Amino acid sequence: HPVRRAAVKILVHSLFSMLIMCTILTNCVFMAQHDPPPWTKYVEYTFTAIYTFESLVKILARGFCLHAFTFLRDPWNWLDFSVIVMAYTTEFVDSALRTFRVLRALKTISVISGLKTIVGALIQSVKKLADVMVLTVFCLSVFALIGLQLFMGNLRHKCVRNFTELNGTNGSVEADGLVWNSLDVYLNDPANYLLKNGTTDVLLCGNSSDAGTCPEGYRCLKAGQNPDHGYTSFDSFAWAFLALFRLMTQDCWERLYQQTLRSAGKIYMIFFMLVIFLGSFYLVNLILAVVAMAYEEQNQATIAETEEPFADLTITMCIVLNTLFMALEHYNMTAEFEEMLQVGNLVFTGIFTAEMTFKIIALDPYYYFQQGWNIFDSIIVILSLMELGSVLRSFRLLRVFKLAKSWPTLNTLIKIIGNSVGALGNLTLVLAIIVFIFAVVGMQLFGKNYSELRHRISDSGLLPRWHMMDFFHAFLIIFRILCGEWIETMWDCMEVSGQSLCLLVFLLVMVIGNLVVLNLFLALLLSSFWWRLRKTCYRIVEHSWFETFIIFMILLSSGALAFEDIYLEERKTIKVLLEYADKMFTYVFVLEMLLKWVAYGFKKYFTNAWCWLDFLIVDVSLVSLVANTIKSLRTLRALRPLRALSRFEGMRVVVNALVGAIPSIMNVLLVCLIFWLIFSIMGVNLFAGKFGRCINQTEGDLPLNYTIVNNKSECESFNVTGELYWTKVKVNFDNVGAGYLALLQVATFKGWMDIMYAAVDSRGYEEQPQWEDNLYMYIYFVVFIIFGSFFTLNLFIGVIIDNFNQQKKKLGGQDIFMTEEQKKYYNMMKKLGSKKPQQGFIFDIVTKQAFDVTIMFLICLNMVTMMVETDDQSPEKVNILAKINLLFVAIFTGECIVKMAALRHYYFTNSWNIFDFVVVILSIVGTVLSDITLFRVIRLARIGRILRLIRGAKGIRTLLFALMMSLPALFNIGLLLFLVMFIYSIFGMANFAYVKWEAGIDDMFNFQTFANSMLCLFQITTSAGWDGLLSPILNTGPPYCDPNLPNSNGSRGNCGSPAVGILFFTTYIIISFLIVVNMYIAIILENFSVA
């Protein structure tokens, strides 16, 4: 027919596809509006017609029925079919159903081949991630059972008032001179709880020695509701699964850490690291490795298919001077300094214009515009000239990128950014489509709920900071979820709207968006990347007993440092013991240094770096001793543990690897500093002096209304009473150094809440912040996070991994983070890993795979039975569960004994047999003990039965074997990390003790004692809540802290030191990043690939 020919001709024509794409984009723009005006209703038909028209065409050319090369045969045409039928259903007859219209956005993926291919590759990646997903579910369930057993109902502890019975009249309580109907109704009343200081949270409390303490007049009691609206708790197994999924993603995990330790006890912190350093880091890095290998296979398949005048120095110096001159800007500039800045900028732009004109005269426009850099310079100079005749100046900053001409690593960053929207732009487009789809889905589903039930989730009188009422805020929430903060807003979402639907939407966006982001990250990363005396001295130094003695002295001296608590002044004998011990260590180490000098001579001793370190430490000790016979030099004694680096080979080899990587690390650090200089200068221009708040101290610590107080001038003018304080946010953009600090907090994603809240309220220059005017400053931070964090971390990781690959290649292909003995044990483990394979009625029955499958089903059923445990369960439920446990123990005993009925070969045939034997023996031990927190441990011992699942699983077994193979390298890395934690905790004890308790620093997670400092350092090893700890350090003087305070040891107030605090926290954050992220990822990926 001719109709078929016409339909085919219109179908194949590119104009038709372009029309479909344009209408899809227009519909996407219309779906952004939260409140569609009535007239747009008419426009709806247009789309419904167009979507019909095109569909009709596809129906005419192809065949509706099923057959080769037909309409419904193509999977994506199902999208057209569903969209058209849904549109007709919604419009023809009678709504939340309209949210399904968002699926029309996916038509974009249909109208471009590149997006189809990208989605296909993503689907194969998801398919390959199946084993890791199963392992993650299994580990999360196991740790969730462990946490449920350990902390069942712990989070419901609260410091309630100490009630008194009214002479047992009717079981009533007369607390605080008020009678309540019953004890149960009294306890559930939140008017008698105790709020945590400076927070709107009920103080969790415990009765264990380590757990938190109830202030005088209060007592710990379990009655109440779980914290943060009751969505965090270990009471039910499913709640524990949610909490440990939160832990695994390290999402606001410091809050759960602090709550659990406050309620149960500090010792339980152990549990947390066993879930973080082996449950969170390990699982995420395993996912990283699996995705990377899948992408590598995809790239290999694609590759196989494809197969078959000296003035430049002057200009660069001028650019460097100009960028530095722009960096000479800050808050409260003097008039003369501002004039000097203006004159300098004017002369710089003048000279740049003159150079551009001269070198465009030398080569005419045809020649001049022949270079990309030349057109870039022309655009920059034109923009600067237009601005000369406000962020309009920031364009000039981009000139610094010219330094990429001969800077290879800045060129690598430029290549990364180019590939982001170049070769790999299709995947970026897919990510953008996903983000838009999820933003509109969330807004359409939750806009009315957020609007009409705002008071539920709005602590302030106005609307909440994060919501889905408007499209921009929905996109902001989706972006925040992508950045990793997916639960803090989820609690509000579930509180204001449906729990089930919000759970589903947020979990889906988390999983899918993080998958896409990780695919983009890995794709970019792979795409872009006397004589007798001397003899005696040598003999005495050479004895191994001498080395052991020196090691013992090093460790014991470090321990002696570990006692410098605030409580020494109370402990007298220990103080004098420590003084004598310190003198002894100084003397013995000096004696050892002299012996080494004599035995080996000055040249050999001073030609060894570690000898230099030991000599420096001893020199500091001697300087301190002679000064005593400098107070700022005493605290440098906290570097004593560094003597342990040279002795133990594990830390020595790890330090060798890190030193080898130092040059590349420094190159990338310089590139990152130059790149972040642009964003810090822009932030200084946008937000210099606009971060101040005229707070009223008496009425809390919240910014005043902009109507009553408008700016600093009015804040000082209304000073009849000394209540108003014009204070600036701790971390801000008043300078470029403060710019780097705030940018670091935004990039690491800790403490960015306050920075963005202060930015998106910046009303003017030192003017009082309005609630949320100047809103679109949000974009600023978003942009930064796209470049300053995503691409910057990509460069970090790529360069460091490339450096480690070069180091491995140089070292004969062997490992980098292992010793000789560890290498031999690793070889033995590898050999053991791939070992080759080696009454009649029962022998024939048990050996059958059906028996193993039945045992597997039985153990799965037992796991399900343990999932049912819950706090405050009725006694009959307890009895039934105990009986079921006894039955399961009996069944396992029966199966093990019938297996034993075979010859003794099974007694040693495999290691899993002995594991089964020992777990059964423990099971009977626990059951017999039941006839007699020890009970909690006995119950927790039952989790060993679940591990029997490992036998059947293949992917689980391989991944766990990879972890076991990686264990020694991780042991070395963790040893070095623990040494660094020890040193930094001693520094904190020396400095940060006595600081005012605010934000992260509370009565339990202080820096006062070694225990508390170690807890804080452990939590901020993952960079979690380091802004919280840093905040109390920064504040100096009123109204925050009170200097001139009678402190125990150092009576110079309770204020922190901003300079040393910032240095301490930034250096520790960077060191911990390096080690735990880069090295741990390197080990995980290497041992997974080899495994």
Ligand SMILES: CCCCCCCC/C=C/CCCCCCCC(=O)O[C@H](COC(=O)CCCCCCCCCCCCCCC)COP(=O)(O)OCCN
């Ligand atoms: C081949 C061998 C290579 C490995 C050895 C090289 C690495 C060793 C490290 C050198 C960096 C140490 C620099 C010392 C900084 C101390 C400055 C200082 O004394 O001030 C103090 C600074 O304290 C701080 O918080 C800064 C924290 C800096 C930590 C440096 C220690 C890092 C230890 C880990 C080494 C690196 C990782 C392991 C080795 C790769 C404050 O006291 P105050 O000012 O006197 O207070 C006044 C009233 N109390």
Ligand SMILES: CCCCCCCC/C=C/CCCCCCCC(=O)O[C@H](COC(=O)CCCCCCCCCCCCCCC)COP(=O)(O)OCCN
């Ligand atoms: C996860 C991270 C990925 C890797 C990071 C890549 C490198 C990006 C780095 C950024 C370094 C951070 C620099 C922070 C500078 C802090 C400046 C600041 O706080 O404000 C200034 C005052 O405070 C001070 O910092 C003065 C003391 C100087 C501290 C020096 C900090 C050294 C930087 C840490 C080391 C950098 C990393 C290198 C590691 C080997 C001025 O502002 P103000 O409003 O006038 O207040 C006056 C009160 N004194």
Ligand SMILES: CC(C)CCC[C@@H](C)[C@H]1CC[C@H]2[C@@H]3CC=C4C[C@@H](OC(=O)CCC(=O)O)CC[C@]4(C)[C@H]3CC[C@]12C
């Ligand atoms: C009886 C009252 C208290 C209401 C009942 C609420 C529970 C039935 C809900 C509350 C929150 C829900 C949890 C919220 C979060 C998760 C995380 C989610 O994690 C994953 O999806 C992991 C995916 C992966 O491993 O990649 C699995 C469902 C789960 C446990 C949900 C299971 C059901 C829970 C516990």
Ligand SMILES: CC(C)CCC[C@@H](C)[C@H]1CC[C@H]2[C@@H]3CC=C4C[C@@H](OC(=O)CCC(=O)O)CC[C@]4(C)[C@H]3CC[C@]12C
């Ligand atoms: C009356 C009050 C407000 C005076 C306080 C002003 C200072 C806080 C300003 C004046 C000089 C400024 C500095 C001028 C020059 C630089 C160079 C600039 O150099 C870099 O580019 C470092 C990073 C790199 O090497 O790329 C970093 C910011 C800094 C230290 C500036 C930080 C803020 C400073 C110290």
Ligand SMILES: CC(C)CCC[C@@H](C)[C@H]1CC[C@H]2[C@@H]3CC=C4C[C@@H](OC(=O)CCC(=O)O)CC[C@]4(C)[C@H]3CC[C@]12C
């Ligand atoms: C009190 C009422 C209002 C709420 C009761 C909670 C239920 C509605 C919870 C119980 C288990 C929850 C489900 C548990 C797990 C998921 C997995 C989640 O999907 C993933 O986690 C992605 C997995 C992957 O693709 O790898 C989507 C939400 C969903 C279906 C949850 C939806 C909500 C459910 C059904």
Ligand SMILES: CC(C)CCC[C@@H](C)[C@H]1CC[C@H]2[C@@H]3CC=C4C[C@@H](OC(=O)CCC(=O)O)CC[C@]4(C)[C@H]3CC[C@]12C
């Ligand atoms: C109203 C009062 C009595 C509250 C009682 C609630 C409990 C009886 C609930 C809370 C947690 C629930 C469990 C949460 C999660 C699962 C996982 C679920 O896992 C599966 O085996 C199905 C998915 C799969 O493995 O393919 C089986 C049901 C079970 C044990 C649920 C059974 C019912 C439990 C124990």
Ligand SMILES: CC(C)CCC[C@@H](C)[C@H]1CC[C@H]2[C@@H]3CC=C4C[C@@H](OC(=O)CCC(=O)O)CC[C@]4(C)[C@H]3CC[C@]12C
């Ligand atoms: C009507 C009156 C008596 C109200 C009280 C009823 C309770 C005694 C019920 C409510 C929930 C029930 C539980 C719900 C779910 C399970 C899972 C079920 O799972 C299995 O373990 C199956 C395998 C097996 O046990 O053989 C075992 C019974 C048990 C614990 C039930 C035991 C009896 C419970 C505690």
Ligand SMILES: CC(C)CCC[C@@H](C)[C@H]1CC[C@H]2[C@@H]3CC=C4C[C@@H](OC(=O)CCC(=O)O)CC[C@]4(C)[C@H]3CC[C@]12C
């Ligand atoms: C108010 C008082 C009574 C509180 C006492 C609480 C302590 C019992 C807690 C707080 C600090 C905790 C420790 C902090 C740091 C570590 C390091 C961690 O790393 C290692 O030490 C492994 C290598 C080694 O064996 O040294 C092991 C757990 C441990 C000892 C923690 C165990 C429990 C501790 C000692």
Ligand SMILES: COc1ccccc1OC[C@H](O)CN1CCN(CC(=O)Nc2c(C)cccc2C)CC1
């Ligand atoms: C990298 O993320 C993750 C890694 C591991 C487990 C979970 C993760 O969260 C998922 C997603 O990556 C969200 N990220 C965004 C950026 N990230 C910054 C960062 O790496 N901080 C950091 C530092 C400075 C030192 C040590 C360890 C870490 C994680 C924070 C979290």
Ligand SMILES: *[C@@H]1O[C@H](CO)[C@@H](O)[C@H](O)[C@H]1NC(C)=O
């Ligand atoms: C407060 O409660 C505690 C709980 O044991 C009790 O010992 C005490 O007598 C009560 N009264 C106070 C602290 O004044």
Ligand SMILES: *[C@@H]1O[C@H](CO)[C@@H](O)[C@H](O)[C@H]1NC(C)=O
């Ligand atoms: C006070 O602040 C709120 C939000 O910060 C704002 O909506 C209101 O207009 C301000 N003025 C008042 C309450 O008089």
